[PDB]
Design a protein around this ligand. Structure first.
Ligand SMILES: C=C1[C@@H](C)[C@H]2[C@H](Cc3ccccc3)NC(=O)[C@]23OC(=O)/C=C\[C@H](O)CCC[C@@H](C)C/C=C/[C@H]3[C@@H]1O
Ligand SMILES: *[C@@H]1O[C@H](CO)[C@@H](O[C@@H]2O[C@H](CO)[C@@H](O)[C@H](O)[C@H]2NC(C)=O)[C@H](O)[C@H]1NC(C)=O
Length: 464
């Protein structure tokens, strides 16, 4: 099993970088912004009014995050062609080259006295994150033996949340996240990638790609032998043959082909809306700007509350992994949406009443965890389960891509928008989220079927 654990470790490193890049931006905000101010003057010089105008600074920061999201969008398109063209191991190695480039670009920003470098590096690391999110679950699913798929599936989510937590604690004022060393955080994401790059070459090649696509059996047999370790792997390749037959009897549809098939619409729309509900809920607000929200809410020390949100996210990630096994899909999503809406109407009230009762900050504090809590129960994992079980074997891949694209695009909006909205609306920002959640809830409650313990067969009938 040694090769198995090593390969799963490499995949987990990929997911860990992905999570770290998701969450590293939150803590150093009030330091990176001051650095931006510093460079923008260094540039202007004699005319400078002794301060970067707030509009430009807000725009640059919102760009610094929305560009991660844009790299994700661009990543959603390619996830397929390269996977079939180069494979999985080679794909992760090249994609790690991209990761190293992006991390170096982000790290060398301040020394270069320019912030365009940081934004470009964030674009590169967004492409990294999208590619690894696409390629890691696939690889672990290929290598995973017949009966450990369920155990390893939750690893791709445990790793992401743990990475968010690590980046969330590695940004304290005393820790790396200070004026002189902040680039180290944005540079730390170079180190694990290098490690992966120096570990993967020893790791095996996913048998399914090797046999199904490149139609070599001998190397597939060798990879299987070094993966599971049995003397003979006749049974697993015999099983591979039947799914080869199934794939050749159902050629996956093309993206424009899939969008052009009237039969697949009602499923498709469902998927897309779910992703919006997962994204336009407003969780990425809590993942990116939670330090600023807490500081606005009057919290005593926003950074500690930020790590608190991270740890609650992790705890209820594990709880959801325990739950989804024995609860359902539709019910979990409705519960999560309803919980997030009331929790955000609490937070709105807490902000609105902060002046009158100073202790309300604690309320706000707890509210956010509740928010995060509920997100990890219903809409965190579930939309992906619904999408996966909604579509047949053939048209699943293309559909996935579209969902991913939507999941990224919505993200961009929130990632790019929140700050402006935060300034325009006031305390009521989360109230907007509540309305959106309420909307989605109603739609879900009356439109999405129940996929757990159901045949694609019946589901199709349910849509009819
Ligand atoms: C808040 C977010 C972060 C925190 C995660 C969040 C938690 C999660 C992670 C992993 C699986 C299921 C749920 N729920 C997510 O959906 C999450 O992560 C992913 O989707 C990651 C990989 C997927 O297997 C393929 C899609 C990967 C991308 C196409 C979409 C990524 C979504 C992010 C999301 O931005
Ligand atoms: C941007 O940089 C300038 C200069 O470093 C900051 O100006 C200092 O700001 C503090 C607090 O506002 C004042 O007490 C100092 O007198 C200012 N020094 C100078 C030389 O002007 C400015 O505040 C910064 N603004 C932002 C938004 O970062």
């Amino acid at each position: 099993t040694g090769t198995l654990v090593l390969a799963v470790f490499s995949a987990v490193l990929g997911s860990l970088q992905f999570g770290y890049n998701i969450g590293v931006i939150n803590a150093p905000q009030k330091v990176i912004e001051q650095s931006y101010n510093e460079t923008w003057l260094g540039r202007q010089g004699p005319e400078g009014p002794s301060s970067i105008p707030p509009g430009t600074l807000t725009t640059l920061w919102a760009l610094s995050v929305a560009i991660f999201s844009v790299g994700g969008m661009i990543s959603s398109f390619l996830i397929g062609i390269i996977s079939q063209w180069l494979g999985r191991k080679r794909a992760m190695l090249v994609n790690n080259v991209l990761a190293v480039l992006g991390g170096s670009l982000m790290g060398l920003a301040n020394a270069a006295a320019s912030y365009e470098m940081l934004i470009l590096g964030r674009f590169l690391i967004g492409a990294y994150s999208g590619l690894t999110s696409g390629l890691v679950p696939m690889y672990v699913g290929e290598i995973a033996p017949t009966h450990l798929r369920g155990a390893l599936g939750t690893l791709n989510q445990l790793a992401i949340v743990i990475g968010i937590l690590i980046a969330q604690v590695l940004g304290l004022e005393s820790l790396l996240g200070t004026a002189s060393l902040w680039p180290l955080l944005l540079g730390l994401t170079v180190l694990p990638a290098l490690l992966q790059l120096v570990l993967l070459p020893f790791c095996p090649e996913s048998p399914r790609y090797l046999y199904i696509i490149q139609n070599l059996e001998g190397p597939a047999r060798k990879s299987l032998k070094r993966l599971t370790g049995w003397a003979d792997v006749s049974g697993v390749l015999a099983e591979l043959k039947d799914e080869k037959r199934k794939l050749e009897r159902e050629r996956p549809l093309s993206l424009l082909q899939l969008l052009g098939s009237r039969t697949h619409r009602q499923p498709l729309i469902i998927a897309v809306v779910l992703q919006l509900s997962q994204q336009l809920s407003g969780i990425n607000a809590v993942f990116y700007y939670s330090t600023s929200i807490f500081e606005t809410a009057g919290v005593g020390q926003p950074a500690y509350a930020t790590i608190g949100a991270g740890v609650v996210n992790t705890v209820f990630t594990l709880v959801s992994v325990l739950l989804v096994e024995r609860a359902g899909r539709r019910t979990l999503h409705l519960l999560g949406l309803a919980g997030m809406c009331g929790c955000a109407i609490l937070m709105t009230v807490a902000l609105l009443l902060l002046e009158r009762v100073p202790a309300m900050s604690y309320v706000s504090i707890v509210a956010i965890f509740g928010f995060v809590a509920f997100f990890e129960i219903g809409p965190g994992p579930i939309p992906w389960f619904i999408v996966a079980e909604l579509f047949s074997q053939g048209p699943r891949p293309a559909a996935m891509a579209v969902a991913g694209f939507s999941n990224w695009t919505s993200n961009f909006i929130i990632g790019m928008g929140f700050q402006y909205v935060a300034e325009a609306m006031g305390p009521y920002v989360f109230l907007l989220f509540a309305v959106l959640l309420l909307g989605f809830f109603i739609f879900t409650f009356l439109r999405v079927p129940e996929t757990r313990g159901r045949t694609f067969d019946q589901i199709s009938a349910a849509f009819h």
